[PDB]
Ligand SMILES: NC(=O)c1cnc(C(F)(F)F)nc1
Protein backbone atom coordinates (compact mmCIF):
# COMPACT_ATOMS: atom_id res chain seq x y z
CA UNK A 301 0.00 0.00 0.00
CA UNK A 302 1.19 3.65 -0.56
CA UNK A 303 0.78 6.93 -2.52
CA UNK A 304 -0.23 7.44 -6.22
CA UNK A 305 2.80 9.34 -7.74
CA UNK A 306 0.22 11.25 -9.99
CA UNK A 307 -2.73 12.03 -7.55
CA UNK A 308 -1.16 10.97 -4.19
CA UNK A 309 -4.56 9.16 -3.80
CA UNK A 310 -3.96 6.23 -1.34
CA UNK A 311 -3.68 2.95 -3.40
CA UNK A 312 -3.00 -0.82 -3.08
CA UNK A 313 -1.58 -1.10 -6.67
CA UNK A 314 1.96 -0.87 -8.16
CA UNK A 315 2.64 -1.12 -11.95
CA UNK A 316 4.72 -4.30 -12.23
CA UNK A 317 6.06 -3.46 -15.77
CA UNK A 318 7.58 -0.15 -14.41
CA UNK A 319 11.13 -0.95 -13.19
CA UNK A 320 10.50 1.20 -10.00
CA UNK A 321 6.94 -0.26 -9.39
CA UNK A 322 5.36 3.11 -8.54
CA UNK A 323 2.15 2.95 -6.43
CA UNK A 324 -0.73 3.89 -8.82
CA UNK A 325 -4.41 4.73 -7.86
CA UNK A 326 -7.30 2.79 -9.47
CA UNK A 327 -7.83 5.76 -11.87
CA UNK A 328 -4.07 6.32 -12.58
CA UNK A 329 -3.11 2.55 -12.63
CA UNK A 330 -5.97 2.07 -15.24
CA UNK A 331 -5.12 5.21 -17.34
CA UNK A 332 -1.48 3.89 -17.32
CA UNK A 333 -2.15 0.20 -18.41
CA UNK A 334 -4.61 1.12 -21.29
CA UNK A 335 -2.35 3.85 -22.82
CA UNK A 336 1.05 1.94 -22.61
CA UNK A 337 2.34 -1.73 -22.93
CA UNK A 338 2.62 -1.99 -19.11
CA UNK A 339 -0.06 -4.56 -18.00
CA UNK A 340 1.45 -6.38 -14.94
CA UNK A 341 -0.20 -4.98 -11.75
CA UNK A 342 1.00 -5.66 -8.16
CA UNK A 343 -1.18 -5.03 -5.03
CA UNK A 344 -0.81 -6.97 -1.73
CA UNK A 345 -0.41 -9.66 -4.46
CA UNK A 346 0.45 -9.73 -8.20
CA UNK A 347 -2.70 -9.51 -10.47
CA UNK A 348 -1.62 -12.71 -12.32
CA UNK A 349 -3.84 -15.77 -13.14
CA UNK A 350 -3.57 -18.23 -10.14
CA UNK A 351 -4.68 -21.14 -12.47
CA UNK A 352 -2.16 -24.02 -12.73
CA UNK A 353 0.41 -23.29 -15.54
CA UNK A 354 -1.46 -20.25 -17.05
CA UNK A 355 0.79 -17.42 -18.43
CA UNK A 356 -1.88 -14.64 -18.16
CA UNK A 357 -0.38 -11.52 -16.41
CA UNK A 358 -2.32 -8.79 -18.42
CA UNK A 359 -4.70 -7.10 -15.91
CA UNK A 360 -7.18 -6.26 -18.78
CA UNK A 361 -7.55 -10.09 -19.36
CA UNK A 362 -8.05 -11.00 -15.64
CA UNK A 363 -10.95 -11.35 -13.12
CA UNK A 364 -11.37 -11.70 -9.31
CA UNK A 365 -13.35 -14.97 -8.71
CA UNK A 366 -13.26 -16.09 -5.05
CA UNK A 367 -10.21 -14.29 -3.51
CA UNK A 368 -7.92 -15.54 -6.39
CA UNK A 369 -7.38 -13.94 -9.87
CA UNK A 370 -8.21 -15.70 -13.22
CA UNK A 371 -8.16 -15.06 -17.01
CA UNK A 372 -11.27 -15.61 -19.24
CA UNK A 373 -10.36 -19.38 -19.45
CA UNK A 374 -9.87 -20.43 -15.77
CA UNK A 375 -12.29 -17.98 -14.05
CA UNK A 376 -15.13 -19.28 -11.82
CA UNK A 377 -18.77 -18.56 -12.81
CA UNK A 378 -18.95 -15.72 -10.20
CA UNK A 379 -16.13 -13.18 -10.98
CA UNK A 380 -15.73 -9.43 -11.77
CA UNK A 381 -12.93 -8.13 -14.06
CA UNK A 382 -9.90 -6.53 -12.24
CA UNK A 383 -9.78 -3.69 -14.79
CA UNK A 384 -13.04 -1.99 -15.97
CA UNK A 385 -14.99 1.28 -15.16
CA UNK A 386 -11.85 3.47 -15.86
CA UNK A 387 -10.40 1.89 -12.69
CA UNK A 388 -8.24 -1.19 -11.82
CA UNK A 389 -9.32 -3.19 -8.70
CA UNK A 390 -7.71 -2.91 -5.20
CA UNK A 391 -8.12 -1.25 -1.73
CA UNK A 392 -9.22 2.43 -1.25
CA UNK A 393 -11.49 2.28 -4.43
CA UNK A 394 -13.68 5.22 -3.15
CA UNK A 395 -10.62 7.60 -2.58
CA UNK A 396 -9.01 8.27 -6.04
CA UNK A 397 -8.87 11.60 -8.08
CA UNK A 398 -6.90 10.83 -11.38
CA UNK A 399 -5.31 13.41 -13.83
CA UNK A 400 -6.23 15.39 -17.04
CA UNK A 401 -3.00 13.99 -18.73
CA UNK A 402 -0.97 10.86 -17.63
CA UNK A 403 1.22 11.48 -20.74
CA UNK A 404 4.43 12.64 -18.90
CA UNK A 405 4.34 9.69 -16.42
CA UNK A 406 3.86 7.14 -19.31
CA UNK A 407 6.85 8.68 -21.21
CA UNK A 408 9.02 8.60 -17.99
CA UNK A 409 7.83 5.02 -17.33
CA UNK A 410 8.64 3.78 -20.89
CA UNK A 411 11.51 6.00 -22.30
CA UNK A 412 14.97 4.27 -22.60
CA UNK A 413 16.88 7.49 -21.51
CA UNK A 414 18.96 7.62 -24.81
CA UNK A 415 17.34 10.94 -26.01
CA UNK A 416 17.88 14.45 -24.49
CA UNK A 417 14.07 14.97 -24.63
CA UNK A 418 13.80 12.31 -21.89
CA UNK A 419 16.02 14.35 -19.45
CA UNK A 420 14.16 17.57 -20.51
CA UNK A 421 10.87 15.97 -19.38
CA UNK A 422 12.34 14.63 -16.09
CA UNK A 423 13.30 18.25 -15.32
CA UNK A 424 10.04 20.07 -16.44
CA UNK A 425 7.46 17.48 -15.21
CA UNK A 426 5.75 17.93 -11.80
CA UNK A 427 8.08 17.51 -8.77
CA UNK A 428 6.69 14.05 -7.79
CA UNK A 429 7.47 12.90 -11.37
CA UNK A 430 11.00 14.47 -11.13
CA UNK A 431 11.55 11.94 -8.23
CA UNK A 432 9.97 8.98 -10.11
CA UNK A 433 12.07 9.93 -13.23
CA UNK A 434 15.27 10.30 -11.09
CA UNK A 435 14.71 6.78 -9.62
CA UNK A 436 13.61 5.23 -13.00
CA UNK A 437 16.68 6.73 -14.78
CA UNK A 438 19.17 5.72 -12.08
CA UNK A 439 17.75 2.15 -11.91
CA UNK A 440 17.97 2.05 -15.79
CA UNK A 441 21.60 3.32 -15.50
CA UNK A 442 22.55 0.58 -12.88
CA UNK A 443 20.79 -2.25 -14.90
CA UNK A 444 22.57 -1.23 -18.17
CA UNK A 445 25.95 -1.87 -16.40
CA UNK A 446 24.91 -5.61 -15.99
CA UNK A 447 24.42 -5.70 -19.84
CA UNK A 448 28.27 -5.39 -20.17
CA UNK A 449 30.48 -8.50 -20.37
CA UNK A 450 32.81 -9.59 -17.50
CA UNK A 451 36.49 -8.77 -18.20
CA UNK A 452 38.97 -11.45 -16.96
CA UNK A 453 42.82 -11.29 -16.54
CA UNK A 454 44.02 -13.71 -19.30
CA UNK A 455 47.72 -12.63 -18.98
CA UNK A 456 49.69 -10.30 -16.63
CA UNK A 457 52.02 -8.69 -19.28
CA UNK A 458 53.79 -6.34 -16.77
CA UNK A 459 52.77 -4.12 -13.80
CA UNK A 460 50.14 -1.39 -14.67
CA UNK A 461 49.46 -3.46 -17.94
CA UNK A 462 47.18 -6.53 -18.60
CA UNK A 463 45.65 -8.87 -21.24
CA UNK A 464 41.82 -9.06 -20.78
CA UNK A 465 39.60 -11.89 -22.08
CA UNK A 466 35.93 -10.73 -22.44
CA UNK A 467 32.61 -12.62 -21.87
CA UNK A 468 31.08 -13.48 -25.36
CA UNK A 469 27.65 -12.27 -26.66
CA UNK A 470 27.70 -9.23 -24.28
CA UNK A 471 29.00 -5.73 -25.18
CA UNK A 472 32.29 -4.43 -23.63
CA UNK A 473 32.04 -1.09 -21.73
CA UNK A 474 34.06 1.90 -23.03
CA UNK A 475 37.59 1.95 -21.43
CA UNK A 476 37.67 5.55 -19.94
CA UNK A 477 37.46 6.94 -16.33
CA UNK A 478 33.60 7.21 -16.63
CA UNK A 479 33.61 3.35 -16.32
CA UNK A 480 35.02 2.24 -12.89
CA UNK A 481 35.33 -1.60 -12.56
CA UNK A 482 35.69 -3.80 -9.44
CA UNK A 483 38.23 -6.66 -9.31
CA UNK A 484 37.50 -10.07 -7.75
CA UNK A 485 39.72 -13.15 -6.86
CA UNK A 486 38.32 -16.71 -7.54
CA UNK A 487 37.69 -18.32 -4.06
CA UNK A 488 36.81 -21.77 -2.59
CA UNK A 489 33.04 -21.32 -3.26
CA UNK A 490 32.49 -17.52 -3.98
CA UNK A 491 34.33 -14.20 -4.84
CA UNK A 492 35.87 -11.36 -2.69
CA UNK A 493 36.37 -7.67 -3.76
CA UNK A 494 39.99 -6.53 -4.49
CA UNK A 495 39.57 -2.72 -5.01
CA UNK A 496 37.85 -0.56 -7.71
CA UNK A 497 39.75 -0.17 -11.08
CA UNK A 498 39.75 1.84 -14.35
CA UNK A 499 41.26 0.84 -17.75
CA UNK A 500 42.64 2.42 -20.99
CA UNK A 501 43.66 0.81 -24.40
CA UNK A 502 47.33 -0.40 -24.63
CA UNK A 503 46.38 -5.37 -23.80
CA UNK A 504 44.98 -2.63 -21.43
CA UNK A 505 46.50 0.01 -19.04
CA UNK A 506 44.79 -0.26 -15.58
CA UNK A 507 44.86 2.37 -12.72
CA UNK A 508 43.51 0.56 -9.58
CA UNK A 509 42.05 1.84 -6.19
CA UNK A 510 44.83 -0.17 -4.38
CA UNK A 511 48.08 -2.05 -5.39
CA UNK A 512 48.17 -5.91 -5.74
CA UNK A 513 49.98 -8.79 -7.52
CA UNK A 514 46.64 -9.53 -9.32
CA UNK A 515 46.96 -12.85 -11.25
CA UNK A 516 45.17 -14.60 -14.22
CA UNK A 517 41.46 -15.49 -13.55
CA UNK A 518 40.85 -12.24 -11.57
CA UNK A 519 37.84 -10.59 -13.31
CA UNK A 520 36.24 -7.12 -13.32
CA UNK A 521 32.64 -5.84 -13.36
CA UNK A 522 31.21 -2.33 -13.04
CA UNK A 523 29.77 -2.69 -9.46
CA UNK A 524 26.11 -1.43 -9.62
CA UNK A 525 24.17 -0.54 -6.41
CA UNK A 526 20.54 -0.65 -5.12
CA UNK A 527 18.69 2.62 -6.03
CA UNK A 528 16.41 3.56 -3.07
CA UNK A 529 12.97 5.15 -3.65
CA UNK A 530 12.95 8.98 -3.30
CA UNK A 531 10.71 10.90 -0.82
CA UNK A 532 11.98 14.53 -0.47
CA UNK A 533 11.62 17.07 -3.37
CA UNK A 534 14.69 18.28 -5.37
CA UNK A 535 14.22 21.79 -3.83
CA UNK A 536 12.34 22.57 -0.59
CA UNK A 537 9.65 25.28 -0.93
CA UNK A 538 11.50 28.64 -1.20
CA UNK A 539 11.05 31.20 1.61
CA UNK A 540 12.26 34.86 1.58
CA UNK A 541 12.83 36.54 4.96
CA UNK A 542 13.01 40.21 5.98
CA UNK A 543 15.82 39.64 8.56
CA UNK A 544 18.70 37.10 8.59
CA UNK A 545 17.04 34.04 10.32
CA UNK A 546 18.59 31.48 12.72
CA UNK A 547 22.17 32.78 12.11
CA UNK A 548 24.26 35.36 14.10
CA UNK A 549 26.77 37.33 11.94
CA UNK A 550 30.32 37.93 13.26
CA UNK A 551 31.18 41.49 14.41
CA UNK A 552 34.83 41.19 13.15
CA UNK A 553 35.54 39.45 9.76
CA UNK A 554 38.91 39.27 7.88
CA UNK A 555 39.37 41.41 4.67
CA UNK A 556 39.86 37.98 2.91
CA UNK A 557 36.04 37.27 3.13
CA UNK A 558 34.76 40.95 3.11
CA UNK A 559 33.80 40.67 -0.63
CA UNK A 560 31.19 37.98 0.34
CA UNK A 561 29.53 39.77 3.35
CA UNK A 562 26.57 41.08 1.21
CA UNK A 563 26.21 37.52 -0.27
CA UNK A 564 26.44 35.68 3.10
CA UNK A 565 23.64 38.02 4.26
CA UNK A 566 21.39 36.97 1.33
CA UNK A 567 22.18 33.34 2.38
CA UNK A 568 20.56 34.25 5.75
CA UNK A 569 17.41 35.93 4.32
CA UNK A 570 16.15 33.06 2.08
CA UNK A 571 15.62 29.30 2.65
CA UNK A 572 17.95 28.28 -0.23
CA UNK A 573 20.26 30.36 -2.43
CA UNK A 574 22.22 29.69 -5.61
CA UNK A 575 25.85 30.82 -6.13
CA UNK A 576 27.24 30.63 -9.68
CA UNK A 577 31.02 30.50 -9.18
CA UNK A 578 32.88 30.58 -12.54
CA UNK A 579 36.40 29.12 -12.74
CA UNK A 580 38.86 30.44 -10.07
CA UNK A 581 36.33 32.98 -8.69
CA UNK A 582 36.38 31.60 -5.08
CA UNK A 583 33.64 28.99 -4.53
CA UNK A 584 35.40 27.09 -1.65
CA UNK A 585 36.70 30.41 -0.20
CA UNK A 586 32.98 31.51 -0.24
CA UNK A 587 31.85 28.20 1.36
CA UNK A 588 34.43 28.24 4.30
CA UNK A 589 33.95 32.04 4.57
CA UNK A 590 30.26 31.41 5.46
CA UNK A 591 31.44 29.57 8.70
CA UNK A 592 33.56 32.58 9.79
CA UNK A 593 30.71 34.98 8.96
CA UNK A 594 28.23 32.77 10.99
CA UNK A 595 30.66 31.39 13.64
CA UNK A 596 28.07 29.49 15.80
CA UNK A 597 26.21 28.02 12.73
CA UNK A 598 26.39 24.19 12.40
CA UNK A 599 27.35 23.62 8.70
CA UNK A 600 27.14 20.37 6.70
CA UNK A 601 29.42 20.68 3.62
CA UNK A 602 28.28 18.16 0.97
CA UNK A 603 29.00 17.30 -2.70
CA UNK A 604 28.66 14.28 -5.03
CA UNK A 605 32.39 13.43 -5.43
CA UNK A 606 34.85 12.54 -2.64
CA UNK A 607 37.25 15.01 -4.43
CA UNK A 608 34.77 17.94 -4.13
CA UNK A 609 34.24 17.22 -0.40
CA UNK A 610 38.04 16.80 0.15
CA UNK A 611 38.70 20.20 -1.54
CA UNK A 612 36.13 21.81 0.86
CA UNK A 613 38.08 20.05 3.76
CA UNK A 614 41.50 21.28 2.49
CA UNK A 615 40.16 24.88 2.49
CA UNK A 616 38.53 24.28 5.93
CA UNK A 617 41.89 23.01 7.32
CA UNK A 618 43.30 26.51 6.47
CA UNK A 619 40.59 28.62 8.31
CA UNK A 620 38.39 26.66 10.86
CA UNK A 621 39.25 24.96 14.21
CA UNK A 622 40.26 21.29 13.30
CA UNK A 623 38.57 19.95 16.55
CA UNK A 624 35.21 21.43 15.21
CA UNK A 625 35.40 19.48 11.87
CA UNK A 626 34.55 15.82 10.99
CA UNK A 627 34.82 13.93 7.63
CA UNK A 628 31.96 11.31 7.28
CA UNK A 629 33.30 8.15 5.47
CA UNK A 630 31.14 5.02 4.94
CA UNK A 631 32.70 1.62 5.98
CA UNK A 632 38.84 4.96 -1.97
CA UNK A 633 41.31 7.14 0.05
CA UNK A 634 39.77 10.50 1.12
CA UNK A 635 40.83 13.42 3.42
CA UNK A 636 42.04 12.01 6.85
CA UNK A 637 42.85 15.08 9.06
CA UNK A 638 39.41 15.36 10.83
CA UNK A 639 37.98 12.92 13.42
CA UNK A 640 36.08 10.44 11.14
CA UNK A 641 32.22 9.95 11.23
CA UNK A 642 31.40 12.44 14.06
CA UNK A 643 27.85 13.49 12.97
CA UNK A 644 27.46 15.96 15.94
CA UNK A 645 30.68 17.97 15.15
CA UNK A 646 29.92 21.63 14.21
CA UNK A 647 31.37 21.33 10.64
CA UNK A 648 30.43 18.05 8.79
CA UNK A 649 32.13 17.21 5.43
CA UNK A 650 30.54 14.17 3.77
CA UNK A 651 29.47 13.11 0.21
CA UNK A 652 25.70 13.00 -0.66
CA UNK A 653 25.31 9.18 -0.64
CA UNK A 654 27.08 8.85 2.80
CA UNK A 655 25.06 11.66 4.52
CA UNK A 656 23.59 10.88 7.96
CA UNK A 657 20.03 11.85 8.96
CA UNK A 658 20.67 15.14 10.88
CA UNK A 659 19.73 18.87 11.05
CA UNK A 660 22.04 21.90 10.46
CA UNK A 661 21.97 25.74 10.38
CA UNK A 662 23.45 25.75 6.83
CA UNK A 663 23.84 23.04 4.15
CA UNK A 664 26.41 23.92 1.41
CA UNK A 665 26.08 21.60 -1.60
CA UNK A 666 29.18 22.26 -3.76
CA UNK A 667 29.86 21.47 -7.44
CA UNK A 668 26.06 21.62 -8.11
CA UNK A 669 26.38 21.16 -11.98
CA UNK A 670 27.50 17.48 -11.30
CA UNK A 671 24.36 16.82 -9.17
CA UNK A 672 21.39 14.83 -10.48
CA UNK A 673 17.81 15.32 -9.16
CA UNK A 674 18.44 11.96 -7.47
CA UNK A 675 21.25 13.62 -5.37
CA UNK A 676 19.19 16.81 -4.81
CA UNK A 677 16.36 14.68 -3.29
CA UNK A 678 18.74 12.59 -1.10
CA UNK A 679 20.18 15.79 0.48
CA UNK A 680 16.67 17.16 1.21
CA UNK A 681 15.71 13.71 2.66
CA UNK A 682 18.83 13.31 4.93
CA UNK A 683 19.36 17.04 6.01
CA UNK A 684 16.70 19.38 7.49
CA UNK A 685 18.43 22.82 7.46
CA UNK A 686 17.43 26.48 8.24
CA UNK A 687 19.32 27.40 5.01
CA UNK A 688 20.55 25.60 1.87
CA UNK A 689 23.29 27.05 -0.35
CA UNK A 690 23.95 25.45 -3.77
CA UNK A 691 27.42 26.39 -5.11
CA UNK A 692 28.47 25.43 -8.65
CA UNK A 693 28.49 26.78 -12.23
CA UNK A 694 25.85 25.64 -14.77
CA UNK A 695 28.49 26.66 -17.40
CA UNK A 696 30.77 23.82 -16.25
CA UNK A 697 30.31 20.06 -16.81
CA UNK A 698 27.34 17.99 -15.63
CA UNK A 699 27.31 14.37 -14.35
CA UNK A 700 27.85 12.03 -17.35
CA UNK A 701 24.55 10.52 -18.64
CA UNK A 702 25.99 7.08 -19.61
CA UNK A 703 22.72 6.29 -21.53
CA UNK A 704 22.34 9.54 -23.55
CA UNK A 705 23.32 9.51 -27.31
CA UNK A 706 20.53 11.54 -29.11
CA UNK A 707 20.28 15.34 -28.50
CA UNK A 708 22.55 17.52 -26.29
CA UNK A 709 21.64 18.24 -22.61
CA UNK A 710 21.38 22.07 -22.12
CA UNK A 711 22.45 23.31 -18.62
CA UNK A 712 18.86 24.30 -17.65
CA UNK A 713 18.27 20.46 -17.65
CA UNK A 714 21.32 19.22 -15.56
CA UNK A 715 19.11 19.41 -12.40
CA UNK A 716 16.44 21.59 -10.58
CA UNK A 717 19.17 23.87 -9.08
CA UNK A 718 20.80 24.52 -12.51
CA UNK A 719 17.30 24.91 -14.05
CA UNK A 720 16.68 27.87 -11.67
CA UNK A 721 20.12 29.50 -12.41
CA UNK A 722 19.50 29.47 -16.21
CA UNK A 723 15.75 30.50 -16.03
CA UNK A 724 15.42 33.12 -13.15
CA UNK A 725 19.25 33.46 -12.74
CA UNK A 726 21.45 32.73 -9.66
CA UNK A 727 20.90 34.44 -6.28
CA UNK A 728 24.63 35.30 -6.32
CA UNK A 729 27.56 35.53 -8.76
CA UNK A 730 31.36 35.49 -8.13
CA UNK A 731 32.17 37.95 -10.98
CA UNK A 732 36.01 38.08 -10.87
CA UNK A 733 38.20 35.23 -12.12
CA UNK A 734 41.59 35.27 -10.22
CA UNK A 735 43.14 32.24 -12.04
CA UNK A 736 43.21 32.92 -15.80
CA UNK A 737 44.82 35.36 -18.24
CA UNK A 738 42.51 38.20 -19.42
CA UNK A 739 42.31 36.64 -22.95
CA UNK A 740 40.67 33.43 -21.52
CA UNK A 741 38.42 35.38 -19.09
CA UNK A 742 37.22 37.69 -21.95
CA UNK A 743 36.51 34.61 -24.15
CA UNK A 744 34.39 32.59 -21.67
CA UNK A 745 32.69 35.76 -20.33
CA UNK A 746 31.27 36.20 -23.90
CA UNK A 747 30.94 32.41 -24.52
CA UNK A 748 28.78 31.37 -21.50
CA UNK A 749 28.61 34.21 -18.83
CA UNK A 750 26.75 37.12 -20.65
CA UNK A 751 29.87 39.41 -20.44
CA UNK A 752 29.63 39.47 -16.59
CA UNK A 753 32.90 37.61 -15.81
CA UNK A 754 35.79 40.10 -15.06
CA UNK A 755 39.57 39.35 -15.31
CA UNK A 756 41.70 39.94 -12.15
CA UNK A 757 45.00 39.16 -14.02
CA UNK A 758 45.99 41.12 -17.21
CA UNK A 759 46.61 39.64 -20.70
CA UNK A 760 49.53 37.12 -20.65
CA UNK A 761 50.05 37.45 -24.46
CA UNK A 762 50.68 33.64 -24.09
CA UNK A 763 47.23 32.53 -25.45
CA UNK A 764 47.49 31.04 -28.99
CA UNK A 765 44.97 29.35 -31.32
CA UNK A 766 45.55 27.37 -34.53
CA UNK A 767 42.86 26.24 -37.04
CA UNK A 768 44.00 22.70 -38.07
CA UNK A 769 41.53 19.85 -38.88
CA UNK A 770 44.38 17.39 -39.46
CA UNK A 771 43.20 13.74 -39.59
CA UNK A 772 40.65 11.99 -37.33
CA UNK A 773 40.98 8.24 -36.66
CA UNK A 774 38.46 6.34 -34.44
CA UNK A 775 39.06 3.38 -32.14
CA UNK A 776 36.35 1.40 -30.29
CA UNK A 777 34.91 4.33 -28.16
CA UNK A 778 37.33 7.33 -28.69
CA UNK A 779 39.04 9.68 -31.25
CA UNK A 780 42.68 10.45 -32.24
CA UNK A 781 44.08 13.41 -34.25
CA UNK A 782 47.80 12.54 -34.79
CA UNK A 783 48.41 15.60 -37.00
CA UNK A 784 47.06 17.90 -34.13
CA UNK A 785 49.65 16.19 -31.79
CA UNK A 786 52.34 16.52 -34.51
CA UNK A 787 51.59 20.31 -34.62
CA UNK A 788 52.04 20.45 -30.80
CA UNK A 789 55.30 18.38 -31.10
CA UNK A 790 56.57 21.10 -33.52
CA UNK A 791 55.33 24.04 -31.37
CA UNK A 792 57.12 22.48 -28.36
CA UNK A 793 60.47 22.16 -30.32
CA UNK A 794 60.17 25.92 -31.09
CA UNK A 795 58.72 26.81 -27.60
CA UNK A 796 60.43 24.41 -25.17
CA UNK A 797 59.26 26.48 -22.12
CA UNK A 798 55.81 24.90 -22.85
CA UNK A 799 57.20 21.45 -21.77
CA UNK A 800 55.85 22.29 -18.26
CA UNK A 801 52.32 22.27 -19.89
CA UNK A 802 49.42 19.90 -19.10
CA UNK A 803 47.94 18.28 -22.28
CA UNK A 804 44.10 18.40 -22.43
CA UNK A 805 41.72 16.95 -25.06
CA UNK A 806 38.07 15.79 -25.17
CA UNK A 807 39.15 12.10 -25.79
CA UNK A 808 41.19 9.69 -23.60
CA UNK A 809 42.63 8.01 -26.80
CA UNK A 810 43.90 11.36 -28.13
CA UNK A 811 45.41 11.75 -24.61
CA UNK A 812 47.11 8.29 -24.69
CA UNK A 813 48.80 8.95 -28.09
CA UNK A 814 49.86 12.47 -26.77
CA UNK A 815 51.48 11.06 -23.55
CA UNK A 816 53.62 8.67 -25.70
CA UNK A 817 54.63 11.41 -28.24
CA UNK A 818 54.95 14.60 -26.03
CA UNK A 819 55.43 13.15 -22.52
CA UNK A 820 53.20 15.97 -21.18
CA UNK A 821 50.86 15.06 -18.31
CA UNK A 822 47.35 14.55 -19.87
CA UNK A 823 43.75 15.19 -18.66
CA UNK A 824 40.34 14.85 -20.29
CA UNK A 825 38.38 18.11 -19.98
CA UNK A 826 36.06 16.08 -17.64
CA UNK A 827 39.03 14.98 -15.41
CA UNK A 828 40.55 18.54 -15.47
CA UNK A 829 37.36 20.13 -13.91
CA UNK A 830 38.41 21.86 -10.60
CA UNK A 831 42.21 21.72 -11.33
CA UNK A 832 44.47 24.62 -12.45
CA UNK A 833 47.78 24.59 -14.40
CA UNK A 834 50.10 27.44 -15.56
CA UNK A 835 50.22 26.14 -19.17
CA UNK A 836 47.61 24.05 -21.02
CA UNK A 837 47.88 22.65 -24.59
CA UNK A 838 44.39 21.73 -25.95
CA UNK A 839 43.77 19.67 -29.12
CA UNK A 840 39.99 19.76 -30.02
CA UNK A 841 40.70 16.43 -31.89
CA UNK A 842 37.15 16.46 -33.59
CA UNK A 843 34.29 18.93 -34.41
CA UNK A 844 31.64 16.60 -32.82
CA UNK A 845 28.88 17.77 -30.41
CA UNK A 846 31.16 16.30 -27.65
CA UNK A 847 34.23 18.34 -28.74
CA UNK A 848 32.22 21.60 -29.33
CA UNK A 849 30.06 21.46 -26.16
CA UNK A 850 30.37 25.10 -24.90
CA UNK A 851 30.51 23.85 -21.24
CA UNK A 852 33.37 21.38 -22.06
CA UNK A 853 35.28 24.10 -23.91
CA UNK A 854 34.61 26.65 -21.08
CA UNK A 855 36.24 24.08 -18.63
CA UNK A 856 39.08 23.21 -21.07
CA UNK A 857 40.53 26.73 -21.54
CA UNK A 858 39.91 28.01 -17.87
CA UNK A 859 42.42 25.41 -16.54
CA UNK A 860 45.27 27.84 -17.54
CA UNK A 861 46.82 30.33 -14.99
CA UNK A 862 49.32 31.77 -17.54
CA UNK A 863 49.22 30.40 -21.13
CA UNK A 864 47.19 28.10 -23.44
CA UNK A 865 47.68 26.69 -26.97
CA UNK A 866 44.35 25.55 -28.53
CA UNK A 867 44.72 23.45 -31.76
CA UNK A 868 41.07 23.80 -32.94
CA UNK A 869 38.96 21.72 -35.38
CA UNK A 870 35.75 23.80 -35.07
CA UNK A 871 35.77 27.10 -37.06
CA UNK A 872 33.01 28.48 -34.72
CA UNK A 873 34.88 28.12 -31.34
CA UNK A 874 38.19 29.05 -33.10
CA UNK A 875 36.64 32.41 -34.13
CA UNK A 876 35.35 32.91 -30.51
CA UNK A 877 38.89 32.38 -29.00
CA UNK A 878 40.25 35.92 -28.23
CA UNK A 879 43.78 34.53 -28.71
CA UNK A 880 46.70 35.17 -31.03
CA UNK A 881 46.29 33.20 -34.26
CA UNK A 882 49.30 31.10 -35.29
CA UNK A 883 49.48 29.67 -38.83
CA UNK A 884 49.99 25.97 -39.76
CA UNK A 885 53.73 25.12 -39.71
N1 LIG B 1 54.00 31.89 -36.12
C1 LIG B 1 53.39 30.90 -36.74
O1 LIG B 1 52.68 31.11 -37.75
C2 LIG B 1 53.56 29.51 -36.21
C3 LIG B 1 53.71 28.42 -37.03
N2 LIG B 1 53.85 27.18 -36.55
C4 LIG B 1 53.87 27.04 -35.22
C5 LIG B 1 54.04 25.64 -34.66
F1 LIG B 1 53.82 24.71 -35.58
F2 LIG B 1 55.28 25.45 -34.20
F3 LIG B 1 53.21 25.41 -33.65
N3 LIG B 1 53.74 28.04 -34.35
C6 LIG B 1 53.59 29.27 -34.85
Ligand SMILES: [Zn+2]
Pocket residue numbers: 315316317318332338409
Ligand atom coordinates in the same frame (compact mmCIF):
# COMPACT_ATOMS: atom_id res chain seq x y z
ZN1 LIG C 1 4.20 0.93 -15.73
Ligand SMILES: [Zn+2]
Pocket residue numbers: 304305306307308309324325326327328329397398
Ligand atom coordinates in the same frame (compact mmCIF):
# COMPACT_ATOMS: atom_id res chain seq x y z
ZN1 LIG D 1 -3.68 8.29 -9.04
Ligand SMILES: [Zn+2]
Pocket residue numbers: 349350351354355356370371372373374
Ligand atom coordinates in the same frame (compact mmCIF):
# COMPACT_ATOMS: atom_id res chain seq x y z
ZN1 LIG E 1 -5.73 -18.55 -16.68
